[PDB]
Subunit: 258 residues, 3 copies
């Protein structure tokens, strides 16, 4: 046994750390860089320019670093960056960026991306996220830390998925999801907050209550989004956790001079 299967294809211009493993019938294309302790399964296609960090696991039938088919993209040298300790399951597609945004699709650390998920050009994923089977980010999607997207969740171009937020299965998301919020259906509707998530992060009980009141201000009291932001000001100064929620709504809603 060697760590790189003789049946794999490694481009001369690829750069692999010493203890990387690559399974049989995998392609590591030009300008792919792979960090210490990462494991590429069999039947994987990597394409560049792509940087993959340390201790990742990528499973069979995944195409990572492919060009978007968007007719916007004309063959420019855009990037894909993946951090550390990620798991990418079978059949996942991840596309590199486009020059019209930041020229980079980026993924953080400790993420779990389950089978057949799609991560479109220019998307940005944080840390500790979970994208369940067949979740699809159309492009330019920002997913902040600890978010969970249930299976077959679809996200339109440019949407922001907030920290600790949660989508139900078969959700079709067309607007930002504020931090902590749970959404369901097609089209997606806000229902509650992800209290399970807050429990696991060990939030105080006072903070959990504050976040429920915050939900009610925004969603259950007839406030416009402007009026809600004003009402949340007190509660956001009292609790770092509520400030995250206010900040996610703030940055979603410029509006127009009326």
């Amino acid at each position: 046994m060697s760590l790189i299967d003789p049946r794999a294809i490694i481009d001369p211009s690829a750069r692999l750390a010493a203890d990387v493993q690559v399974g049989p019938w995998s392609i590591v294309g030009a300008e792919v860089e792979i960090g210490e302790g990462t494991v590429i399964g069999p039947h994987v296609v990597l394409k560049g320019p792509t940087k993959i960090g340390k201790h990742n696991r990528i499973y069979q039938f995944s195409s990572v670093g492919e060009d978007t088919p968007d007719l916007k993209y004309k063959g420019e040298p855009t990037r894909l960056v993946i951090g550390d300790h990620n798991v990418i399951r079978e059949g996942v597609t991840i596309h590199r960026g486009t020059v019209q945004d930041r020229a980079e699709t980026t993924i953080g650390d400790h993420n779990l991306i389950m089978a057949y998920a799609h991560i479109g050009h220019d998307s940005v994923i944080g840390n500790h996220c979970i994208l369940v089977n067949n979740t699809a980010l159309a492009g330019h999607v920002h997913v902040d830390d600890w978010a969970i997207l249930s299976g077959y969740t679809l996200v339109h171009q440019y949407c922001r998925i907030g920290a600790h937020s949660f989508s139900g299965m078969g959700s079709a998301i067309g607007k930002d999801v504020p931090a902590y919020v749970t959404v369901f259906g097609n089209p997606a509707e806000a229902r509650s907050m992800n209290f399970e998530g807050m429990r696991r992060r060990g939030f105080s009980s006072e903070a959990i209550h504050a976040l429920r009141r915050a939900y009610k201000v925004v969603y259950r009291q007839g406030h416009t989004v402007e009026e809600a932001l004003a009402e949340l000001a007190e509660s956001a100064a009292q609790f770092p956790e509520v400030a995250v929620f206010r900040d996610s709504i703030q940055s979603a809603t410029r509006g127009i001079t009326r």
Copy 2:
């Protein structure tokens, strides 16, 4: 000429019956057992401990016997069991069980599992079922005989799908589906009974009528589930087919002491 492609990989500890066929670039991992007359296509990944029965057909890009990514599972030696005369189409994922249930994902006989379907840990499928393209069982799902799940049907953890039942396409099922019942939408709603299915099994005309009346008792007459079960008692003693229906509702609805 041998029936196992020289380009395939067969683990020393795998056990294949005499006339098994394996296509090129397929992996038959450690502790996989394959029965008489089964055909593995090209580009298939089998992983163990897995037992596959006789006269199965498994198509390209399928990963059968993989570990769930559920953070619940910590690497214990769980099983997958597949029966006889099944067809598993391209890109299907089937996961082995978890110690927290029965340590076994199990599939019966004569099933058709179409492209890109997912069968989660600890799920149990009976005989003569059809899972259409991209049907997903989240885990611990029991599918009883002759069920049909239309394309892109999603099923939450722990749901029971009844015998001869039928889901429409893009269904999102969160509670049990009684036998014979047809459900549609996200979230799934009961609509009618799968009379097409009863026709194919050659049910008597008296039994079909009895099952329609049974549907009406449970769904269209303002009965509580307890009151419906009581009303069905007569009809379930008269017809084996109605007993299947009553039994599926019975075993769905312990409830809580009120």
Copy 3:
């Protein structure tokens, strides 16, 4: 050479001189591939299949496979693909059945994105876009310039009209008239694909005529028969409206009442 030594080419396959085939791809019996086409790695082609010129087919695609429909009993049905198509990763395309025309057919300049499914006997025109995980159950006709957003599902026998547009996660169970936009599960008509008309450089008079046509069919309490009658004037005035009328016409025979 342009054919990877790690690929498998059946003796009975017929490849034009400058076809490229990636490693670990199978070009099965009775597959024909035209000038300038590129097959990626890890592709499975099966026949009888005819693929035209300047196509690009990506990894993990199974093109020309038999339907699993229990209707089909192993007869030699066909798949035909035209010119300048792009088929992205993981796409499945099935050949036809003897119970229809024995042929699944795809035109020119189409883009079929990852994990899309094209069921037996479906017919796709030109310039269409099927986005990730779009699924045509079978016998589906998609006319020119249609766009099906991601995870759009289409029931057997539906006609998707020219320039029509489905929103994401649409579940389509009846015909979609030309130009119409539909959304949801079950799919509902909302408006017309004006963006699409802009790109084709339709006249401004034609765009207006098509909006009025939408209103006749959908927003004025007309039966479909009454709408067709009302559209007759406007369809003679504008080729673009005739496409719309014709899509509704051919959707609605009905029964003698």
